[PDB]
Design a protein around this ligand. Sequence first.
Ligand SMILES: *[C@@H]1O[C@H](CO)[C@@H](O[C@@H]2O[C@H](CO)[C@@H](O[C@@H]3O[C@H](CO)[C@@H](O)[C@H](O)[C@@H]3O)[C@H](O)[C@H]2NC(C)=O)[C@H](O)[C@H]1NC(C)=O
Ligand SMILES: *[C@@H]1O[C@H](CO[C@@H]2O[C@H](CO)[C@@H](O[C@@H]3O[C@H](CO)[C@@H](O)[C@H](O)[C@@H]3O)[C@H](O)[C@H]2NC(C)=O)[C@@H](O)[C@H](O)[C@H]1NC(C)=O
Lengths: 274, 638, 305
Amino acid sequence: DGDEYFIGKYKEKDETLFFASYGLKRDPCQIVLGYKCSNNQTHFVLNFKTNKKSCISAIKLTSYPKINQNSDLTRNLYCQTGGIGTDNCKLVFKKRKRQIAANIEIYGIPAKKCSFKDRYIGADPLHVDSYGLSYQFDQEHGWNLERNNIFKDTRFSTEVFYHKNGLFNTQITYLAEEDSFSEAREITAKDIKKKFSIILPNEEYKRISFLDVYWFQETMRKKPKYPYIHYNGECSNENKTCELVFDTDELMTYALVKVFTNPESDGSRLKEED
Amino acid sequence: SPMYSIITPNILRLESEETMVLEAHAQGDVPVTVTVHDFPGKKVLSSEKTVLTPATNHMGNVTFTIPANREFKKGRNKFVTVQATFGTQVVEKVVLVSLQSGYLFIQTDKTIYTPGSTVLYRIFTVNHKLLPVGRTVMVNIENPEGIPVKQDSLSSQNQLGVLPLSWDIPELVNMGQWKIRAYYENSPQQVFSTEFEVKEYVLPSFEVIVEPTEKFYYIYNEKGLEVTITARFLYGKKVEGTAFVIFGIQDGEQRISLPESLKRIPIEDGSGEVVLSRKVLLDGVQNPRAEDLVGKSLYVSATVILHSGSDMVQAERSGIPIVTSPYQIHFTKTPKYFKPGMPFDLMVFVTNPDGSPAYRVPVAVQGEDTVQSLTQGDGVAKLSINTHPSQKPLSITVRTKKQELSEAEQATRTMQALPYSTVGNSNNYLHLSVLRTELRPGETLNVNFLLRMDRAHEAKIRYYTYLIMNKGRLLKAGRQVREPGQDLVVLPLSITTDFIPSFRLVAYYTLIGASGQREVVADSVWVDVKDSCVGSLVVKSGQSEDRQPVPGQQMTLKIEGDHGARVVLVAVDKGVFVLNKKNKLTQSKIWDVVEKADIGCTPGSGKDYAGVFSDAGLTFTSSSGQQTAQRAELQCPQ
Amino acid sequence: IVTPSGCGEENMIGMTPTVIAVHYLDETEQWEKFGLEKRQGALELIKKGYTQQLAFRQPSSAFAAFVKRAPSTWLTAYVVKVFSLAVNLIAIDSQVLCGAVKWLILEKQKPDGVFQEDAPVIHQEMIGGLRNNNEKDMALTAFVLISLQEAKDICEEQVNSLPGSITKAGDFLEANYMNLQRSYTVAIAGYALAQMGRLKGPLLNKFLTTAKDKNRWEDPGKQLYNVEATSYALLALLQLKDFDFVPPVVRWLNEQRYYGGGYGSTQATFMVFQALAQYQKDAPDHQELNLDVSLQLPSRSSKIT
Ligand SMILES: *[C@@H]1O[C@H](CO)[C@@H](O[C@@H]2O[C@H](CO)[C@@H](O[C@@H]3O[C@H](CO)[C@@H](O)[C@H](O)[C@@H]3O)[C@H](O)[C@H]2NC(C)=O)[C@H](O)[C@H]1NC(C)=O
Ligand SMILES: *[C@@H]1O[C@H](CO[C@@H]2O[C@H](CO)[C@@H](O[C@@H]3O[C@H](CO)[C@@H](O)[C@H](O)[C@@H]3O)[C@H](O)[C@H]2NC(C)=O)[C@@H](O)[C@H](O)[C@H]1NC(C)=O
């Protein structure tokens, strides 16, 4: 069947930037249509770049033969430079002594309507997140829970970091069952800098209760350096517009945010832990 | 009243340089803005501004560059609206853009290949100035059946026009005429072709040529047809062997052989002497009349076997013509329109009936007497005939008064000429007739501006404006005053290396036709230059020609060329030329490709001024409403 | 090519055929045999007619035959559609058209979403299919909805109730598709519903079975109705991207060879020409073909795709 590694979400109504089969034991590759390689025992790098007015939407690599190893233990594919939403990325994939062949297809969508709000949301986001996994709750306090079937890492206390299908995910802080989803916001590449902030309504029925962040970021190594995302100030009832700043060690490529509102919320959410 | 007009090329190419001309008939500093915007609709491409100078009589030495656009793309072809405004008035016209952004010269190292070798080829991407340019090219390798076996797409950015590609021939492959088709990425209809053999062959050790003493054939020869055999080794030595010679007739899509004329001859020291008798040729066919063989050619197939019986060299001199007259007349470079009253010179092209130019042969006229000329190396003669001032059409034929020949061997051909449609019956014409000599770079050509106006208004033509069109572009512009009392002026133009291969010298000047009304009298004449390189690239040996080269030895080659040029070398055996000499790259091929792609095919002097410029490849438009037609195709009709 | 002259209503009749010819030639890329910049004069006359129409402007940012006469809903929708279709050649007033759209939506419309006209047009030739007073209200509503959706691409930043009006009209006309008698109104209602994507299932049945001979929506008199309905069908199919029924109707269209001319044969000609222009713009030279052919060998581990 093959080992399929995914970056981004596949769309059935789009076109592919290119598609090529690569012999991973070749030294070096064949420069197909003008793209360079770097092949080693432990690494395979494709310095792909396109000459079309479009932005990368997804990447899928199929490795042969199929080897029974879970793909959620570590990360295999990542665009070292650029990534999803750009026109080119330096795609790095780490090989094994058994994998000897690869089949790389890359998809791009027109740069005009270069948005991903139509594929990462789904039909009902109330019970299912972007990962496609259902929400699980606990009866101790009627709130959410934690998932332990994917790749996660922590740096400080009460820090959540998830990585799946090239998606980096975080939740601040926790979500209640009775809350009703309002809407979402997206950030394009042209609106992304080293540091940037957001402004959200926090009045009447738009009282902020829970937020989640999904993004695509670059890596300078197999182990990434997570951005330092921290809330500034207090999202209290007095200040009508709540704000949040982002500090990044590595430049981001895409950003998606979902808004959860509950008028009965007190503006603070933290377990009885120390 | 001040008078204004536009001068533009008939076709402009994307990513190139175009030049238009403006004239004021309105002294004073007046600015002009030229705007190029796409058609159909009003979407802007380019805009330029330039102020005229009264001290310079307001010539338009103004240029523009069309943008390298991307939304121009399928369906029918596309047009562009070009607009000009000298501050107060607007003049616009429709022009055609060409997908032929340049030329691609595909040159392979060989002509014939074996299964299990490598085809090496270079694509030379030039523009319409024959200059290197950077584009994207799509290359296809097609099998003899007609379906590609490989496709590729390369870029020529910072490559100086040389795109070196290669292909590996499989050992299990189909034999025949393989094709390479390369075209620019923007132009899928700009297919350039290169056909090469794939065959199972081996190198011949000598070249055999079969040459006739008389390069044509005559019906009434009382001796026969003599052909001689020159079998020489590819290194220029002489052979000793035998040869087999057979003949035939080249009819329509068939070949008839004559086993009676199957002769065997000893090649005596690289020489042979084969005589085909008239009786054998007559008995080959079953026609009671020999004159029915006129219009068909013979072919000689020879095959020379060495005294060792080693090599096998079958050479054919196809196309030995059988003609009553050994001279054929052409009207290729002669205009189809005559000038009443004005002396109408004819460009006479008399040749051997297979295209090779004649030499030292005169021309005669049925009515005219004592008039004769001589033929130079290129093969063009000259004559001058005064024409009927009335509207009587002129139909004349070229006869030959060559000595030591019979009067029944003089060729003839009726030529149809049409009178020029003079506006207002003014009887005003123009003739840029040039003395026919050998034009070389660095020389001076005394171009003559023949004039024929009337004494009523001859003194009102102050100056003449001449334009040079080479490779479909306005090469140069200039003016020359015409003071009253002069009927002929000479322009000692210094012919440079930029006039190759030819240049249409068109001339224009204003006029008033019999009542306060604007008219333009104009004409162009076809002028050709001797076809050498624009640059100077030669190859020779740096030694002093002491002794012959020996295998395995080094020689210090000397190459002379321009500065900042990229010279590519190819060393190929002449044995491939023995097996297949077809499809070889030569400068004459490059110039023929240019001429076939040139905007002009008729010499000039059309029915009217609009026809004159259509032949010359120009578009003139003014506020008075006068305008020319348009053309949509790429090559001239028929 | 007809010289635009007359009152506000007569200017449309005078200059509509030139406009439709210019747009059809522009979209079809057949300018090579029409006159070599006759478009210059055609657009100059079109601009003159546009200035003449602007000369009869009203404070409600609409247009009508008389300055003192209240604008007609159908006339306003037709003018808006015509001016919106021509937004690629000459400059067009933006605020005035948006104000007319807002007036049509907020004022000339019931709260339920049904548009009602108050002042019928003076001339009886440009009415078209509205002569028969059987289903005037819903036909007017559908025409207004079509014009509003055509103009939606620009005036959305000036009108905030346009999506609500469109939703109301679509949801109202969804349930009324089963109570129509005349055929060409059935066709136009189907096209209007399919414009947004509310034509699925049993509605298509009325488009397929109820229609006479499945290709002609004929009515007593006014032969143009047929081709008008024909064009609607094409547009609907072009909205659904179905090649099963398009080529036969397209072939049948060429057997008529009609180019206007007659009494009030202008609106139908414009609609059929714009439908043909959309057909040419959208339909490719071929059908969709994207193959992904793979193969596997018992001796080779990789899948050769
Ligand atoms: C096997 O080959 C791969 C490449 O296919 C090697 O990965 C590359 O290793 C070099 C050197 O370790 C990395 O270069 C780095 O560049 C940064 C840029 O500032 C510089 O600061 C560092 O000091 C370093 O020179 C390069 O990034 C890296 N590429 C990837 C995609 O990881 C790998 O090291 C090879 N393993 C061997 C030879 O054992
Ligand atoms: C809603 O706003 C809350 C207050 O804004 C922050 O704090 C002060 C006011 O309390 C803002 O103005 C400052 O006031 C100081 C005097 O107390 C001045 O000395 C100072 O120069 C400045 O003018 C201040 O700009 C603003 N930001 C910061 C970083 O202090 C804030 O506390 C809430 O968190 C906020 N609600 C949110 C973000 O959801």
